[PDB]
Design a protein around this ligand. Structure first.
Ligand code: A1CFE
Length: 330
């Protein structure tokens, strides 16, 4: 089998992407944030504290003839940005772009933190990291991809995120019309539960490529590109007036600037992030200070190839017995 679903930016900055997902019988369609950096499929629901729901579409398990309480199971997750959610668990039928999984753990939120409440466009998350990170207790649950994998034509999914435009998540096949050139594959470590890989270096604008190993994760659920402070300083030094602001929480730059591109290495191949992808707009409405899309990972503890990087590529998440990651230009 295969599935194919369009993913759409939630706002004009590409702060995140939502993909429609059918849950239950009859189907309840929720718009979920597909997140290769976590491993829980959780939704706003009829159980979510009413004051914490503000415009989201909710899953109502009592209206699904295929929903079953997973008795005794609870979940609780805290994300790198400080947001969090928790609740109980149902199993139900879940379909993405025509690909159906029966018995999928659907984690129903009883509580969500303020950042989730305040984002009316995201009805929940669909985790696509390794199932060893799933938070359900006392019986850990499998991701949608892990449950689908044996049925898929090929044990893979692909992320093709758009810049200011819709893109695509495919399951079970590589669309050879969706990228240019060849796909370069690179090794993955699953030891931390992430799609963790090592970039071979970087360049800033038209500058010379610096060969250096950068270990990080491919994370569709993180907006920005977080890299070591040395790399990030070298980037922003090429932008007149750019500076790290402790009050704002990162690098800012004059909104009047034209940003240079940023290139990262995948083996001997190179992915170029255009400068415009690195502009996240005014720090507050009407400000002439703009927020940078490349930020330091110092204090996170891991480098993160988030949407800024991944949307410059066609990315293959290869879940074969030995997982790997592929990147192509597009
Ligand atoms: C301080 O300046 C900022 C802060 C945030 C954004 C943007 N709306 C966003 N939401 C989630 C992630 N990002 C980048 C843009 C400028």
């Amino acid at each position: 089998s295969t599935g194919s679903a369009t993913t759409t930016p939630i706002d004009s900055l590409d702060d995140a992407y939502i993909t429609p997902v059918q849950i239950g019988t009859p189907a309840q369609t929720l718009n979920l944030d597909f997140d290769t950096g976590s491993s829980d499929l959780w939704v706003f629901s009829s159980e979510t504290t009413a004051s914490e729901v503000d415009g989201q579409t909710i899953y109502t398990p009592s209206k699904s003839t295929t929903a079953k309480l997973l008795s005794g199971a609870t979940w609780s997750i805290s994300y790198g940005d400080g947001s969090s959610s928790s609740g109980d668990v149902y199993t139900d039928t879940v379909s993405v772009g025509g690909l159906t999984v029966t018995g999928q753990a659907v984690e129903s939120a009883k509580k969500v933190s303020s950042s989730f409440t305040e984002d009316s466009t995201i009805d929940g998350l669909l985790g696509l990291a390794f199932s060893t990170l799933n938070t359900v207790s006392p019986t850990q649950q499998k991701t949608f991809f892990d449950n689908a994998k044996a049925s898929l034509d090929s044990p893979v999914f692909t992320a093709d995120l758009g810049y200011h435009a819709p893109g695509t998540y495919n399951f079970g096949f590589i669309d050879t019309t969706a990228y240019t050139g060849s796909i370069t594959y690179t090794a993955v470590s699953t030891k931390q539960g992430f799609w963790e890989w090592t970039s071979t270096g970087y360049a800033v604008g038209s500058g010379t490529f610096k060969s250096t190993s950068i270990d990080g994760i491919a994370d569709t659920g993180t907006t920005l590109l977080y890299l070591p402070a040395t790399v990030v300083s070298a980037y922003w030094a090429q932008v007149s007036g750019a500076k790290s602001s402790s009050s704002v929480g990162g690098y800012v730059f004059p909104c009047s600037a034209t940003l240079p591109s940023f290139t990262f290495g995948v083996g001997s191949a190179r992915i170029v992030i255009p400068g415009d992808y690195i502009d996240f707009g005014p720090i507050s409405t009407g400000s002439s200070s703009c927020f940078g899309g490349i930020q330091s990972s110092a204090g996170i503890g891991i480098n993160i190839f988030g949407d800024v990087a991944l949307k410059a590529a066609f990315v293959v998440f290869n879940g074969a017995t030995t997982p790997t990651l592929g990147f192509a230009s597009k």
